[PDB]
Chain length 258, copies 3
């Protein structure tokens, strides 16, 4: 399934794999590597150094592997790494790393990035995440697996979005969102847990109840987070699902969304 | 000539004789374009899609793409746009899903401003304005003359009533009755669009009957069941109040309060 | 320098070393100054002047007509100065005859991806408009202002020198010089001291502006009493005169 439209500009240092497609008026820039079966639409701008894995799909008007704009981050080389089976919709902007942080922006596998979403310098996205239309990761954002950020979710620099978490549309996130937690509003506020997400992805009823207890332990009982960690220790040893919640509290860099 | 020679026209596309297409635009398989329509440069049209007459579609617009929505599995769904519409810079419009009616529908005399998004299965009527970055998530019904201010977000299945108004940055999760003004995240009911009613030449008598109708729904501690009973009389007298009352009766997600 | 896949209207006015990328349009009555790089997939429309050492990124539409129902095809203008960065998919509309028939941008401005500069807006120098910031129309942004991501500004609002909006701010009244605003609707929080240090303000000016803020926001004064009370400090510190003038010139009212 290989088709390179001759109206595309492929840099001589660019590398295409088996069954790669590139649509008309797209740019595949110097030091861009595209893996097996990846389909690039028309009017795409790819810049490097960038590595894209297998069976990805990048839509028109997207700018993937651009430099972060503030000419105060003005160092090179900086990397973008994209895994496999990712969908990047119309007009998505993805920026490479900065030498004054990770020197890399990282995206894993099976992610859906919907139209006009922004992924800022040095962000890390895991696997099976959904960033709905116009979601903006300001920079240095960590989104763990199965997270869903609803349309127009803004995320401040350095925030961690926990596994299976959920933001409502127009949420503005200024602190870490623990794993499984649902946040709404500007500024973002914890509501409940993504119980629906746990169910759809086959979480045991015991796991789900231990996470309902785990939520109370952290949010409702007036405990210091050290007190909360010690309280969760046992349920965390029983339930890998609770340990994921505990780990997100523990590693929270400047507080949790309350 | 009127079709730029740097444009890609699929052989299966049907274009009325005076249609213009700018350079580096794509008119995909099973795209129909009616008389007097101008497609600018850098436009992607995908089908199956019917665009009517005297429309204008600006650079960087994606009209007729598949929804990324997980429940779409490549079914042969449709997009219909009527006549006299303006689609500005970078607008996205997605085709329908078979789970609903298999069609995204836009009417006539609509102004859809830059980076607006019209989600799978949405229905827009006539003379609507979607300001910059308005996003209809999917299955959204926007009735005639509705104005959605910039960065207005609309949840799946919401109904936006005729002559309604949203303030900028409004996040709508519940239905907006006809005539109602909503503001904020989450959206809150403030009043009725009296400025829009006067702009359209409504009668003093119809405006007054709608002023009183708002009070009955929103300011008398009535349940909606009770409010609907109380509106029956004035709804029987005034078509404008019938439209308001019908929008509440048809408000499946509940009404914005 | 001019990619042969670009379209340059004959009536365009490109200076010696201007670069235009592939599949970009430099339309009629579009002037571009020395050292300016037009990226690929850019649309320029005129009447428009673009100064020197500018960078305009892909999928930008610079100089389009406002879709505003009050515009009607008149030959309104867009003027951009020097050393500006206009990022991916930015929209800049030309003016209307209802105001000064001109949209204006000064020097050293950073306008990030999908930002919108509506008809008749006036941006000064060394401003940052972060991603998806929107100036609805007739918005004045004075020098060194920072508007964070998805800041929305209602028509006619003035954004004062060194002011700061937090992400998702929705501004419906003027923001005085130096003031930090957040939320929808925007509310005043504090002053932009990081901005004052970035400018090498003396601690004396920074202390005077710290005082000036309290006099306006924290001492239950009316604007007029605040303006009267600020005359001493304003006559002494130009920095405070900037604060004071920005409140004096807000006949709409100030973000509270
Ligand atoms: O069809 C898509 O939208 C994805 C791949 C693509 O853009 C493409 C690849 C090769 C040749 C083409 C000729 C015309 C239009 C698109 C293409
Ligand atoms: O279900 C929820 O809570 C929000 C739904 C939502 O954010 C969404 C979904 C799909 C496409 C969209 C496009 C634009 C804006 C929002 C969306
Ligand atoms: O709080 C912070 O750290 C971010 C401040 C902000 O709004 C921002 C800054 C830089 C790039 C961005 C891209 C998209 C959205 C927001 C931003
Ligand atoms: O807020 C006002 O002053 C007008 C209402 C509005 O939302 C608007 C109007 C025109 C262009 C716009 C561009 C971007 C965002 C908002 C607008």
């Amino acid at each position: 399934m290989s088709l390179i439209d001759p109206r595309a500009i492929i840099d001589p240092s660019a590398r295409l794999a088996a069954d790669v497609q590139v649509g008309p008026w797209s740019i595949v820039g110097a030091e861009v590597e595209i893996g097996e079966g990846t389909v690039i639409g028309p009017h795409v701008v790819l810049k490097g150094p960038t590595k894209i894995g297998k069976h990805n799909r990048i839509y028109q008007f997207s700018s993937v592997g651009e430099d972060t704009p503030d000419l105060k981050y003005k160092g090179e080389p900086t990397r973008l790494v994209i895994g496999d089976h990712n969908v990047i919709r119309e007009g998505v902007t993805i920026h490479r790393g900065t030498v004054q942080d990770r020197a890399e922006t990282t995206i894993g596998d099976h992610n859906l990035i919907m139209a006009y979403a922004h992924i800022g310098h040095d962000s890390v996205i895991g696997n099976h995440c959904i960033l709905v239309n116009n979601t903006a990761l300001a920079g240095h954002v960590h989104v763990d697996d199965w997270a869903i950020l609803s349309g127009y979710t803004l995320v401040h620099q350095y925030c961690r979005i926990g596994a299976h978490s959920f933001s409502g549309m127009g949420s503005a996130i200024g602190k870490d969102v623990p794993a499984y937690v649902t946040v709404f509003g500007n500024p973002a506020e914890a509501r409940s847990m993504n119980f629906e997400g746990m169910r759809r992805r086959g979480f045991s009823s015991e796991a789900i109840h231990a996470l309902r207890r785990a939520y109370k332990v952290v949010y409702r009982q007036g405990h210091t987070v050290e007190e909360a960690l010690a309280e969760l220790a046992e349920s965390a040893a029983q339930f890998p699902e609770v340990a994921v919640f505990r780990d997100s509290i523990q590693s929270a860099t400047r507080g949790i969304t309350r």
